[PDB]
Amino acid sequence: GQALYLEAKKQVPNQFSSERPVGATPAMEVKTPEHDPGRAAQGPRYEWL
Amino acid sequence: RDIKVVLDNKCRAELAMKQPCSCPVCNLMKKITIRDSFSSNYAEPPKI
Amino acid sequence: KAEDFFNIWEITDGAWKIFRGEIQVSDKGWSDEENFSKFLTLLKGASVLVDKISGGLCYLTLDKPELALEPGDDASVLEISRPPYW
Amino acid sequence: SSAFSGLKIPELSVDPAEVFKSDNPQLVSVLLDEFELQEQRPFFSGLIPEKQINIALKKSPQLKKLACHLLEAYEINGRRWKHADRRRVLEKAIRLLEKVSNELKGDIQKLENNVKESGKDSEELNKTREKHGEILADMGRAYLHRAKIIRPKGFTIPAKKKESLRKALDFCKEAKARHLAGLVGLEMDRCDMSDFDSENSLEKLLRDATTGVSLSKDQYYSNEYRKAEYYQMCIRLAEIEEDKHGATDEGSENNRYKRLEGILGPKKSQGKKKGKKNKKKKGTNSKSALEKIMAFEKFKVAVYLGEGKEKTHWNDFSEFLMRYPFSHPSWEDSVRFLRRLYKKGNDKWRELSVALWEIAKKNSAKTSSIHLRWYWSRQRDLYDLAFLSALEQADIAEDESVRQEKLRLAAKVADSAKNRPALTWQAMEQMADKDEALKKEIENYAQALGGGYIEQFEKTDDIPDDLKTSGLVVQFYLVHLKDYENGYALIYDGKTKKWSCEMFNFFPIWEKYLQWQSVYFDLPANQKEESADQLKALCLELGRHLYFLFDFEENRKAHEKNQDTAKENWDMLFIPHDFLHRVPIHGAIKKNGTNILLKKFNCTYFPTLPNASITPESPKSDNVAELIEYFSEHEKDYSEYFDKIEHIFDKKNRAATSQDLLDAAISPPRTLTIYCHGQSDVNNPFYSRLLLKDKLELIKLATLQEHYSGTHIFLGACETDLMPPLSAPLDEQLSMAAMFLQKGVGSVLGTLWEAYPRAVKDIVKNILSADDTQYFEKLFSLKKKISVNQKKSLYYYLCFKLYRSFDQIGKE
RNA sequence: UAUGUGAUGGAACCUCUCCGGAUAAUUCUAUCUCUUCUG
Ligand SMILES: [Zn+2]
């Protein structure tokens, strides 16, 4: 199937639409802390399944 | 998304920031664990 | 509407599930029986409470404590394996 | 036209039939399948068969001609079009060029295998490769043009611009283009992105683009624009060579700019033959686009090398800055130029920063009456540079009067940006639904993105005078310049009238506040009092870093303690800035840990520096109180608890709506008690709303047209839950009390964090039991409930903030 | 195949937009086939 689809897109033009790519761009950000986060005193005490 | 609709928030999580976002949306999902799931009774190919 | 995306890899095969490792304790750490027993108790409790490791859900089983290559870091590129009979 | 003459207009891709009048079927097919047909009814026509000369069996030349025509039209008449037309034209050209490039690349790929067996046949294959390179260069041009006008949504640079610039750079490098690569590098540099490595150095790109370049008779440099980018490239190259510190030569540092000016200056124009100077009636000296856009470059080079004056370029530079909006890249270029001068150390920054700040204020004042300034990418830098220049020229002065006037100027500079918050692009784009003028301004700013020489723009109460009081005024200010982080606090002594300056560090205070905020937000709603230890640590750090406040008690003792009459004017005014709006400044603890600032000094805050010379009139209605209270069915406990107030004279209005608040505003009572919950919004501070029967928000209250008169307002909505959590020290937001003070109210009392009911009801009872003149006495009598031994008392009784006005403070 | 007094990556919905539509009476009369031998 995929092979025949490729042959069609190749040999048979005007059979399909293609302004498909818009508003995407991949993004991957990371940043290390600059200040000490500190310490807390509230922790878990229950669990639900 | 459902919990944000319920609590009426507009959080985006802004990917990586200087400090953790806090706020209830990011304070409740930080303590929720969800298992992945699979189709228990269906394995046939789908329709077009 | 979507704003951003990235790429992931997932392994769901049954064979590649169980992972095994070990912890090494030197002679100085084993100062006496009491300290080793307390360390084992704390380690067992912590191992019990572990829930998620490496993007998945798992549980840890701890056994009894009793005992006595190159990555080709040069320039190289290889991808797009496709499949057989292509 | 010497063209196809089928398209109705370049900016609207439509064809009004008439395509079939031509004979080439390929042209008709291309014009039909890739353009809008226009008209309102279907069109059914065809050509005649049996046509010779074949059909040429391809579409690549026609598509290339369409792409070239579209790019030429965009280059020529791109200024007059609107944003949507530019986007549409650029997208269509990119699509056509991409299709042509894909077809050519596929053809080359298939031909490569066949020519491999031809014994290394150098033939039209080379011409196909050259055509592919030309198409790649055109694609790079189109991508750069599209990226130059991307709308900057959000605080940071959008990713779309980054990917577009990367694609343009890749295409230009693969196409072996030097001028386009230099342009892409220049655009990348101004975006502050640093994805390039040492191999892809900006210096090498500029050198390649500028190596062996002369005016000559080259067609590419015939137009003035390309000369302009050549001049910009040369200027940036000289700047980077000087900044490398490897070219620190006494003679060459001026020789490079001298030859740059010689290139800029008249290159010995020969051949005019002295054409009689035929008295062209002084035709207004019509400045060409070349000088119109190179005024900035001329000013820069004159500053760099000019031993004499340079005011001629300053004259038209000032008007160019005044006419054009803040989205023009010239503003960022000027700010970066000022920063570079300040780092180098030439007084031009000192004499220019104040002028640029004044021009920026004048341009920003022409906005709507809503008092918004919009988010300019580099705006805090200009204000910080102006403040630092004022301080530096104050320090070097040898006259006391000059010192005082420069300190007053610095105080005015700090004051200028303390009330109007910037609201990004998308936020006010959404907010601009109601106002058409705001929509017009947004459209103008969007059109101003990219390039210059726009015909639309061309064809067109004393603040520091005298503070009359016997108290002390503190004007905090924080400098957020990257390499010169510091803090400042201007103190104005009423007795002496002289201003003072000093410096302090705020990073430990920021860290302590961050820890307290995290521990407070992570706690449950009913257990918010557990943050007492973190609050005490924050207060102790504040006292440690602000010890200089306690110094004035020695001067007070020297002044009136020796005098027979003690208890002089000990009032204190605080003007918080940036993140200092959410910390207990009055809760500072002395270094030894035994003295509290609130114990000795009566501290009150104010949103800005007061300058109004009118005292609010006495209330028209002498009603005692106007309690307004709403709650959900869950929290009936608060409604049950509040009964001591309803015993007192009140026409209780439970489950009241915003219209009740407006009606109360119509007839202002002596005291108003607005007690309700609140919710915060991150997109707009103007969307911060109160949890009444309806939603109040800030935009509704901003325009009311009815002013209070001497109404003491008590707000039950805490600041922490009315505002979003704070990340990074940079903050620009408005508070409910700040907007209430614009309505002629007397004073506003608020709570910084949740105050549980016993304390708020006791405070309400005490303030209602107070009389008219001595109301502030019982208001300030809460000091007896604050002690350092018990942290709970500090948590409970340090959350009260009073917005007392200057014109009424210290008045007896 | 880590390197150890410091990992919210369970810290992110492949989302959004688009009539399997258009045109056609389950109807009906002219031949078919090439080599015959002097006639
Ligand atoms: Zn959040």
PDB file of N, CA and C in Angstrom, chain D residues 382-448:
ATOM      1  N   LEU D 382      17.117  51.225  28.460  1.00  0.00           N
ATOM      2  CA  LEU D 382      17.209  52.666  28.252  1.00  0.00           C
ATOM      3  C   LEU D 382      16.942  53.432  29.541  1.00  0.00           C
ATOM      4  N   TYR D 383      15.920  53.023  30.297  1.00  0.00           N
ATOM      5  CA  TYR D 383      15.626  53.683  31.565  1.00  0.00           C
ATOM      6  C   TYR D 383      16.774  53.514  32.551  1.00  0.00           C
ATOM      7  N   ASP D 384      17.340  52.307  32.626  1.00  0.00           N
ATOM      8  CA  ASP D 384      18.462  52.071  33.527  1.00  0.00           C
ATOM      9  C   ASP D 384      19.667  52.911  33.132  1.00  0.00           C
ATOM     10  N   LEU D 385      19.940  53.015  31.829  1.00  0.00           N
ATOM     11  CA  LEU D 385      21.063  53.824  31.370  1.00  0.00           C
ATOM     12  C   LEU D 385      20.843  55.298  31.679  1.00  0.00           C
ATOM     13  N   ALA D 386      19.614  55.789  31.502  1.00  0.00           N
ATOM     14  CA  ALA D 386      19.323  57.178  31.843  1.00  0.00           C
ATOM     15  C   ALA D 386      19.507  57.431  33.334  1.00  0.00           C
ATOM     16  N   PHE D 387      19.028  56.508  34.171  1.00  0.00           N
ATOM     17  CA  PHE D 387      19.194  56.653  35.614  1.00  0.00           C
ATOM     18  C   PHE D 387      20.667  56.657  36.001  1.00  0.00           C
ATOM     19  N   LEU D 388      21.449  55.739  35.429  1.00  0.00           N
ATOM     20  CA  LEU D 388      22.872  55.673  35.743  1.00  0.00           C
ATOM     21  C   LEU D 388      23.603  56.918  35.261  1.00  0.00           C
ATOM     22  N   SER D 389      23.232  57.438  34.087  1.00  0.00           N
ATOM     23  CA  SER D 389      23.840  58.670  33.597  1.00  0.00           C
ATOM     24  C   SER D 389      23.528  59.840  34.517  1.00  0.00           C
ATOM     25  N   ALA D 390      22.279  59.934  34.981  1.00  0.00           N
ATOM     26  CA  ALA D 390      21.921  60.998  35.913  1.00  0.00           C
ATOM     27  C   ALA D 390      22.723  60.887  37.202  1.00  0.00           C
ATOM     28  N   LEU D 391      22.846  59.673  37.744  1.00  0.00           N
ATOM     29  CA  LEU D 391      23.618  59.489  38.970  1.00  0.00           C
ATOM     30  C   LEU D 391      25.087  59.840  38.761  1.00  0.00           C
ATOM     31  N   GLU D 392      25.663  59.420  37.633  1.00  0.00           N
ATOM     32  CA  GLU D 392      27.072  59.690  37.371  1.00  0.00           C
ATOM     33  C   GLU D 392      27.334  61.182  37.212  1.00  0.00           C
ATOM     34  N   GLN D 393      26.476  61.888  36.472  1.00  0.00           N
ATOM     35  CA  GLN D 393      26.673  63.323  36.322  1.00  0.00           C
ATOM     36  C   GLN D 393      26.306  64.086  37.588  1.00  0.00           C
ATOM     37  N   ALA D 394      25.559  63.461  38.503  1.00  0.00           N
ATOM     38  CA  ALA D 394      25.376  64.048  39.826  1.00  0.00           C
ATOM     39  C   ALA D 394      26.632  63.900  40.674  1.00  0.00           C
ATOM     40  N   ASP D 395      27.275  62.730  40.613  1.00  0.00           N
ATOM     41  CA  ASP D 395      28.459  62.490  41.432  1.00  0.00           C
ATOM     42  C   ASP D 395      29.606  63.416  41.047  1.00  0.00           C
ATOM     43  N   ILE D 396      29.820  63.620  39.745  1.00  0.00           N
ATOM     44  CA  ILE D 396      30.955  64.413  39.284  1.00  0.00           C
ATOM     45  C   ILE D 396      30.757  65.907  39.476  1.00  0.00           C
ATOM     46  N   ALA D 397      29.538  66.349  39.770  1.00  0.00           N
ATOM     47  CA  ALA D 397      29.286  67.770  39.950  1.00  0.00           C
ATOM     48  C   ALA D 397      29.969  68.282  41.212  1.00  0.00           C
ATOM     49  N   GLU D 398      30.474  69.514  41.144  1.00  0.00           N
ATOM     50  CA  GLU D 398      31.141  70.145  42.273  1.00  0.00           C
ATOM     51  C   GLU D 398      30.284  71.194  42.968  1.00  0.00           C
ATOM     52  N   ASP D 399      29.046  71.390  42.529  1.00  0.00           N
ATOM     53  CA  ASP D 399      28.144  72.365  43.122  1.00  0.00           C
ATOM     54  C   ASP D 399      26.992  71.652  43.818  1.00  0.00           C
ATOM     55  N   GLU D 400      26.637  72.138  45.009  1.00  0.00           N
ATOM     56  CA  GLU D 400      25.552  71.519  45.765  1.00  0.00           C
ATOM     57  C   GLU D 400      24.222  71.650  45.035  1.00  0.00           C
ATOM     58  N   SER D 401      23.951  72.821  44.453  1.00  0.00           N
ATOM     59  CA  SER D 401      22.706  73.007  43.715  1.00  0.00           C
ATOM     60  C   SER D 401      22.642  72.091  42.499  1.00  0.00           C
ATOM     61  N   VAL D 402      23.756  71.959  41.775  1.00  0.00           N
ATOM     62  CA  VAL D 402      23.797  71.055  40.629  1.00  0.00           C
ATOM     63  C   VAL D 402      23.591  69.615  41.083  1.00  0.00           C
ATOM     64  N   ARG D 403      24.210  69.238  42.203  1.00  0.00           N
ATOM     65  CA  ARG D 403      24.013  67.900  42.747  1.00  0.00           C
ATOM     66  C   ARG D 403      22.544  67.647  43.060  1.00  0.00           C
ATOM     67  N   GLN D 404      21.890  68.608  43.716  1.00  0.00           N
ATOM     68  CA  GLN D 404      20.488  68.432  44.080  1.00  0.00           C
ATOM     69  C   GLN D 404      19.597  68.351  42.846  1.00  0.00           C
ATOM     70  N   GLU D 405      19.851  69.192  41.841  1.00  0.00           N
ATOM     71  CA  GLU D 405      19.011  69.160  40.646  1.00  0.00           C
ATOM     72  C   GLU D 405      19.216  67.868  39.862  1.00  0.00           C
ATOM     73  N   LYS D 406      20.449  67.354  39.823  1.00  0.00           N
ATOM     74  CA  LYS D 406      20.685  66.084  39.144  1.00  0.00           C
ATOM     75  C   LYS D 406      20.048  64.925  39.903  1.00  0.00           C
ATOM     76  N   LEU D 407      20.071  64.972  41.237  1.00  0.00           N
ATOM     77  CA  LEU D 407      19.386  63.943  42.014  1.00  0.00           C
ATOM     78  C   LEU D 407      17.880  63.997  41.793  1.00  0.00           C
ATOM     79  N   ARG D 408      17.317  65.204  41.700  1.00  0.00           N
ATOM     80  CA  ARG D 408      15.898  65.333  41.385  1.00  0.00           C
ATOM     81  C   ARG D 408      15.589  64.781  39.999  1.00  0.00           C
ATOM     82  N   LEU D 409      16.480  65.024  39.033  1.00  0.00           N
ATOM     83  CA  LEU D 409      16.292  64.463  37.697  1.00  0.00           C
ATOM     84  C   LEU D 409      16.328  62.940  37.723  1.00  0.00           C
ATOM     85  N   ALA D 410      17.251  62.364  38.496  1.00  0.00           N
ATOM     86  CA  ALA D 410      17.308  60.910  38.623  1.00  0.00           C
ATOM     87  C   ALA D 410      16.040  60.364  39.270  1.00  0.00           C
ATOM     88  N   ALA D 411      15.530  61.060  40.288  1.00  0.00           N
ATOM     89  CA  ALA D 411      14.283  60.641  40.920  1.00  0.00           C
ATOM     90  C   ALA D 411      13.123  60.691  39.935  1.00  0.00           C
ATOM     91  N   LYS D 412      13.065  61.740  39.112  1.00  0.00           N
ATOM     92  CA  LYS D 412      12.025  61.827  38.091  1.00  0.00           C
ATOM     93  C   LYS D 412      12.151  60.698  37.076  1.00  0.00           C
ATOM     94  N   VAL D 413      13.385  60.370  36.681  1.00  0.00           N
ATOM     95  CA  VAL D 413      13.605  59.273  35.742  1.00  0.00           C
ATOM     96  C   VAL D 413      13.098  57.963  36.329  1.00  0.00           C
ATOM     97  N   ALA D 414      13.411  57.708  37.600  1.00  0.00           N
ATOM     98  CA  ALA D 414      12.920  56.497  38.250  1.00  0.00           C
ATOM     99  C   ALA D 414      11.399  56.499  38.345  1.00  0.00           C
ATOM    100  N   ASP D 415      10.809  57.662  38.625  1.00  0.00           N
ATOM    101  CA  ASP D 415       9.361  57.762  38.778  1.00  0.00           C
ATOM    102  C   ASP D 415       8.657  57.479  37.454  1.00  0.00           C
ATOM    103  N   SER D 416       9.244  57.935  36.341  1.00  0.00           N
ATOM    104  CA  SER D 416       8.534  57.980  35.062  1.00  0.00           C
ATOM    105  C   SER D 416       7.889  56.646  34.700  1.00  0.00           C
ATOM    106  N   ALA D 417       8.566  55.535  34.973  1.00  0.00           N
ATOM    107  CA  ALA D 417       8.022  54.211  34.687  1.00  0.00           C
ATOM    108  C   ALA D 417       7.810  53.478  36.009  1.00  0.00           C
ATOM    109  N   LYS D 418       6.680  53.767  36.659  1.00  0.00           N
ATOM    110  CA  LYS D 418       6.306  53.071  37.882  1.00  0.00           C
ATOM    111  C   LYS D 418       4.820  52.751  37.975  1.00  0.00           C
ATOM    112  N   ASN D 419       4.011  53.151  37.005  1.00  0.00           N
ATOM    113  CA  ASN D 419       2.573  52.919  37.075  1.00  0.00           C
ATOM    114  C   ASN D 419       2.013  52.225  35.844  1.00  0.00           C
ATOM    115  N   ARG D 420       2.536  52.525  34.654  1.00  0.00           N
ATOM    116  CA  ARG D 420       2.020  51.939  33.425  1.00  0.00           C
ATOM    117  C   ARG D 420       2.676  50.583  33.200  1.00  0.00           C
ATOM    118  N   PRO D 421       1.925  49.480  33.213  1.00  0.00           N
ATOM    119  CA  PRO D 421       2.536  48.172  32.954  1.00  0.00           C
ATOM    120  C   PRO D 421       2.471  47.770  31.488  1.00  0.00           C
ATOM    121  N   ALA D 422       3.573  47.247  30.957  1.00  0.00           N
ATOM    122  CA  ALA D 422       3.568  46.703  29.606  1.00  0.00           C
ATOM    123  C   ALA D 422       2.754  45.415  29.562  1.00  0.00           C
ATOM    124  N   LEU D 423       2.013  45.220  28.468  1.00  0.00           N
ATOM    125  CA  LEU D 423       1.088  44.097  28.366  1.00  0.00           C
ATOM    126  C   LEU D 423       1.299  43.257  27.112  1.00  0.00           C
ATOM    127  N   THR D 424       2.537  43.153  26.621  1.00  0.00           N
ATOM    128  CA  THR D 424       2.887  42.210  25.561  1.00  0.00           C
ATOM    129  C   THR D 424       2.124  42.547  24.278  1.00  0.00           C
ATOM    130  N   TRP D 425       2.243  41.712  23.247  1.00  0.00           N
ATOM    131  CA  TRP D 425       1.541  41.919  21.986  1.00  0.00           C
ATOM    132  C   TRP D 425       0.183  41.222  21.962  1.00  0.00           C
ATOM    133  N   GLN D 426       0.168  39.909  22.207  1.00  0.00           N
ATOM    134  CA  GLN D 426      -1.063  39.136  22.072  1.00  0.00           C
ATOM    135  C   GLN D 426      -2.114  39.562  23.089  1.00  0.00           C
ATOM    136  N   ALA D 427      -1.687  39.927  24.299  1.00  0.00           N
ATOM    137  CA  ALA D 427      -2.644  40.266  25.347  1.00  0.00           C
ATOM    138  C   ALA D 427      -3.487  41.474  24.955  1.00  0.00           C
ATOM    139  N   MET D 428      -2.841  42.576  24.568  1.00  0.00           N
ATOM    140  CA  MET D 428      -3.613  43.737  24.143  1.00  0.00           C
ATOM    141  C   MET D 428      -4.188  43.573  22.743  1.00  0.00           C
ATOM    142  N   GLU D 429      -3.647  42.660  21.931  1.00  0.00           N
ATOM    143  CA  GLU D 429      -4.320  42.324  20.681  1.00  0.00           C
ATOM    144  C   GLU D 429      -5.695  41.735  20.954  1.00  0.00           C
ATOM    145  N   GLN D 430      -5.786  40.850  21.946  1.00  0.00           N
ATOM    146  CA  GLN D 430      -7.083  40.330  22.366  1.00  0.00           C
ATOM    147  C   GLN D 430      -7.918  41.411  23.044  1.00  0.00           C
ATOM    148  N   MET D 431      -7.285  42.256  23.859  1.00  0.00           N
ATOM    149  CA  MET D 431      -8.018  43.286  24.586  1.00  0.00           C
ATOM    150  C   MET D 431      -8.569  44.377  23.672  1.00  0.00           C
ATOM    151  N   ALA D 432      -8.015  44.534  22.469  1.00  0.00           N
ATOM    152  CA  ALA D 432      -8.362  45.637  21.579  1.00  0.00           C
ATOM    153  C   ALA D 432      -9.681  45.431  20.842  1.00  0.00           C
ATOM    154  N   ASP D 433     -10.514  44.480  21.270  1.00  0.00           N
ATOM    155  CA  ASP D 433     -11.794  44.266  20.602  1.00  0.00           C
ATOM    156  C   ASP D 433     -12.709  45.475  20.750  1.00  0.00           C
ATOM    157  N   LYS D 434     -12.739  46.078  21.941  1.00  0.00           N
ATOM    158  CA  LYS D 434     -13.676  47.167  22.195  1.00  0.00           C
ATOM    159  C   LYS D 434     -13.243  48.459  21.511  1.00  0.00           C
ATOM    160  N   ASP D 435     -11.949  48.765  21.534  1.00  0.00           N
ATOM    161  CA  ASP D 435     -11.438  50.041  21.046  1.00  0.00           C
ATOM    162  C   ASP D 435     -10.951  49.890  19.610  1.00  0.00           C
ATOM    163  N   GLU D 436     -11.502  50.706  18.710  1.00  0.00           N
ATOM    164  CA  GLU D 436     -11.035  50.721  17.330  1.00  0.00           C
ATOM    165  C   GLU D 436      -9.718  51.470  17.182  1.00  0.00           C
ATOM    166  N   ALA D 437      -9.497  52.511  17.990  1.00  0.00           N
ATOM    167  CA  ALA D 437      -8.226  53.228  17.941  1.00  0.00           C
ATOM    168  C   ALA D 437      -7.072  52.321  18.347  1.00  0.00           C
ATOM    169  N   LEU D 438      -7.291  51.469  19.351  1.00  0.00           N
ATOM    170  CA  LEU D 438      -6.272  50.497  19.727  1.00  0.00           C
ATOM    171  C   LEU D 438      -5.996  49.528  18.587  1.00  0.00           C
ATOM    172  N   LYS D 439      -7.041  49.122  17.861  1.00  0.00           N
ATOM    173  CA  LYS D 439      -6.844  48.248  16.709  1.00  0.00           C
ATOM    174  C   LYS D 439      -6.035  48.943  15.619  1.00  0.00           C
ATOM    175  N   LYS D 440      -6.308  50.228  15.380  1.00  0.00           N
ATOM    176  CA  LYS D 440      -5.529  50.979  14.399  1.00  0.00           C
ATOM    177  C   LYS D 440      -4.068  51.083  14.819  1.00  0.00           C
ATOM    178  N   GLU D 441      -3.819  51.343  16.104  1.00  0.00           N
ATOM    179  CA  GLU D 441      -2.443  51.413  16.589  1.00  0.00           C
ATOM    180  C   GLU D 441      -1.744  50.066  16.461  1.00  0.00           C
ATOM    181  N   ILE D 442      -2.462  48.978  16.743  1.00  0.00           N
ATOM    182  CA  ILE D 442      -1.888  47.643  16.603  1.00  0.00           C
ATOM    183  C   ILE D 442      -1.536  47.365  15.148  1.00  0.00           C
ATOM    184  N   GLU D 443      -2.426  47.737  14.226  1.00  0.00           N
ATOM    185  CA  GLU D 443      -2.138  47.557  12.808  1.00  0.00           C
ATOM    186  C   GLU D 443      -0.926  48.376  12.384  1.00  0.00           C
ATOM    187  N   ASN D 444      -0.821  49.612  12.879  1.00  0.00           N
ATOM    188  CA  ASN D 444       0.327  50.446  12.541  1.00  0.00           C
ATOM    189  C   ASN D 444       1.625  49.839  13.063  1.00  0.00           C
ATOM    190  N   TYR D 445       1.612  49.337  14.301  1.00  0.00           N
ATOM    191  CA  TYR D 445       2.805  48.699  14.851  1.00  0.00           C
ATOM    192  C   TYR D 445       3.176  47.445  14.069  1.00  0.00           C
ATOM    193  N   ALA D 446       2.180  46.644  13.684  1.00  0.00           N
ATOM    194  CA  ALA D 446       2.458  45.447  12.898  1.00  0.00           C
ATOM    195  C   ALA D 446       3.051  45.804  11.543  1.00  0.00           C
ATOM    196  N   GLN D 447       2.529  46.854  10.906  1.00  0.00           N
ATOM    197  CA  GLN D 447       3.067  47.283   9.620  1.00  0.00           C
ATOM    198  C   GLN D 447       4.482  47.831   9.759  1.00  0.00           C
ATOM    199  N   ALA D 448       4.789  48.479  10.884  1.00  0.00           N
ATOM    200  CA  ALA D 448       6.115  49.053  11.084  1.00  0.00           C
ATOM    201  C   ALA D 448       7.212  48.003  11.219  1.00  0.00           C
TER     202      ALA D 448
END
